[PDB]
Symmetry: none
């Protein structure tokens, strides 16, 4: 016998975030789960898994990468509930 119980009775006005998981029993992947409440903001990638036999004989390659510039990011509340409160962003 397997039982799980959460939050039987509630009187009032809360804020909640619930998650429940139960498990009973060149690249390979099997039987996985990814991304329950997942956040990604800025991510970069250049070269990945070109192939079996690239650039075998007598190759000449030049590789250069530049990253610059004016950028801004602004966030007030992230992944956090609130009740009976005040939030403001003023510029």
């Amino acid at each position: 016998p397997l039982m799980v119980k959460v939050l039987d009775a509630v009187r009032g006005s809360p804020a909640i975030n619930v998650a429940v998981h139960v498990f009973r029993k060149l690249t390979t992947e099997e039987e996985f789960v990814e991304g329950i409440y997942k956040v990604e903001i800025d991510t970069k990638s250049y070269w990945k898994a070109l192939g079996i036999s690239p650039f075998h004989e007598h190759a000449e390659v030049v590789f250069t990468a530049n990253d610059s510039g004016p950028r801004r990011y602004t966030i007030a509340a992230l992944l956090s509930p609130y009740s009976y409160s005040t939030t403001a962003v003023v510029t």
Copy 2:
């Protein structure tokens, strides 16, 4: 017999974050879980898993990477609940 019990009775107005996990029984991966309440802001990668036999014979390679520039990040509250409070970001 396996039992789990959390937060039977609540009177009032709280803020909560709950997570429950139960498990009963070139690259390979099996039977995994990734990313329960996961955050990533700035991440970089260049070269990964090109292939079996790259650049075998008489290769000439030049590799250079530059990273610079004006950037800003601003966050007030991250992964933290609050109640009966004040939050402000002023510039």
Copy 3:
């Protein structure tokens, strides 16, 4: 018999973070969990797992990496709840 009990009765308005885990029974990985309340801000990687036999015979390689520039990061509260309090960021 296996039992777990947490927070039966609550009167008032708190802030909480709960996590419960139960387990009963070139690269290989099996039966793992990663990233329960995990945070990463700035992470870099260049070369990883190119392949079986790269750069076998008579290779010439030049590798150089530069990292510089004006950057700023600002955070007020991270992974810490509060109640009946004040938080402000002023510039």
Copy 4:
């Protein structure tokens, strides 16, 4: 018989962080857990696990790494709850 009990009754408004773990029974890893309340801010890596037989015969390599520049990090509270308090960051 195995039993665990935490925080039966609470009257008031506290701030808490709870974690419970129970376990009853070129690279290889099995049956592990990583990253319960884990934080990483600035981390770097260059070369890792190139392959079985790289740079076998008559190789010429030049390796140089430079790291410099103006950077700032500012944090007020990290992994520490508070109640009935004041927090401010002023520049």
Copy 5:
């Protein structure tokens, strides 16, 4: 019979950090746990686990590493709760 009991009754508003662990029964690792309330700020690594037989015959290598520059880090409270207090960072 195995029993554990912590914090049966609480009246008031404290700040707490709790952790409970119970265990009853080229690289290899089995049955481990890593990173319960773990913090890392600045960490570097250069070369690790290149492969079985690198640089076998008649190699010429030059290795040099430079680390410098203006950097600042500022933290007010780290891994320490407080109640009925004041915290400020002024520049």
